[PDB]
Design an enzyme around this catalytic site. Structure first.
Site, PDB file in Angstrom:
ATOM      1  N   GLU A 171      -6.783   6.719  -9.606  1.00  0.00           N
ATOM      2  CA  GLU A 171      -6.129   5.462  -9.380  1.00  0.00           C
ATOM      3  C   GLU A 171      -5.979   4.575 -10.623  1.00  0.00           C
ATOM      4  O   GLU A 171      -5.128   3.718 -10.664  1.00  0.00           O
ATOM      5  CB  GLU A 171      -6.934   4.712  -8.280  1.00  0.00           C
ATOM      6  CG  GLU A 171      -7.006   5.475  -6.951  1.00  0.00           C
ATOM      7  CD  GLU A 171      -5.724   5.492  -6.139  1.00  0.00           C
ATOM      8  OE1 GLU A 171      -4.752   4.794  -6.638  1.00  0.00           O
ATOM      9  OE2 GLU A 171      -5.598   6.111  -5.123  1.00  0.00           O
ATOM     10  N   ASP A 179       2.530   0.126  -6.845  1.00  0.00           N
ATOM     11  CA  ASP A 179       2.034   1.480  -6.765  1.00  0.00           C
ATOM     12  C   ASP A 179       3.199   2.474  -6.813  1.00  0.00           C
ATOM     13  O   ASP A 179       4.360   2.094  -7.038  1.00  0.00           O
ATOM     14  CB  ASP A 179       1.023   1.668  -5.635  1.00  0.00           C
ATOM     15  CG  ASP A 179       1.599   1.785  -4.216  1.00  0.00           C
ATOM     16  OD1 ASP A 179       2.886   1.848  -4.115  1.00  0.00           O
ATOM     17  OD2 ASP A 179       0.925   1.888  -3.232  1.00  0.00           O
TER      18      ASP A 179
END
Ligand SMILES: [Cl-]
Ligand SMILES: [Cl-]
Length: 162
Positions: free
Chosen positions: A11, A20
């Site tokens: 991440e 994202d």
């Protein structure tokens, strides 16, 4: 290597609101804020999550605090889910981390949607499960991350992350 280090590699870490891969407002270590297009709806969620007026920016500690909460929630969600729990109970410690990773990324509902692969994992048919996991939107959209997760299921080692 452990769940925390594994997710931190997948991440990344960002101290300012970002979008994202799907285009949603996120912050910290993969902490989804909202699916709404509003950058303001995102700053609102953010202050609410942190308990202060952040103006879209947080510190490392705050990022780490959200990260601890999120891993804990993932694990607890697996243990509370009737389709996930049996799978988790059946696995060794490494593969358990691979399931937590999938849940952290796509939610409990998403994962429970991988019915066929879950059944293969439970039966410990590693190669067959890795093949079936790859026939998914997940693998097509985030191929490098999916490959690492899948290899972890196939081998039961941390090789893809080392
Ligand atoms: Cl929260
Ligand atoms: Cl990727």
């Amino acid at each position: 290597m452990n769940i925390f280090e594994m997710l931190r590699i997948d991440e990344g870490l960002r101290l300012k609101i970002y979008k994202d891969t799907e285009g949603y407002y996120t912050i910290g270590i993969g902490h989804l804020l909202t699916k709404s297009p509003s950058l303001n709806a995102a700053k609102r969620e953010l202050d609410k999550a942190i308990g202060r007026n952040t103006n879209g920016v947080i510190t490392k500690d705050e990022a780490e605090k959200l990260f601890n909460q999120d891993v804990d929630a993932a694990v607890r969600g697996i243990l509370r889910n009737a389709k996930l729990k049996p799978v988790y109970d059946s696995l060794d410690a490494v593969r358990r981390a691979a399931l937590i990773n999938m849940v952290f990324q796509m939610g409990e509902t998403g994962v429970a949607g991988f019915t066929n692969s879950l059944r293969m994992l439970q039966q410990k048919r590693w190669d067959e499960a890795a093949v079936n996991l790859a026939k998914s939107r997940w693998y097509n959209q985030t191929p490098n991350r999916a490959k690492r997760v899948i290899t972890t299921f196939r081998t039961g080692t941390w090789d893809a992350y080392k």
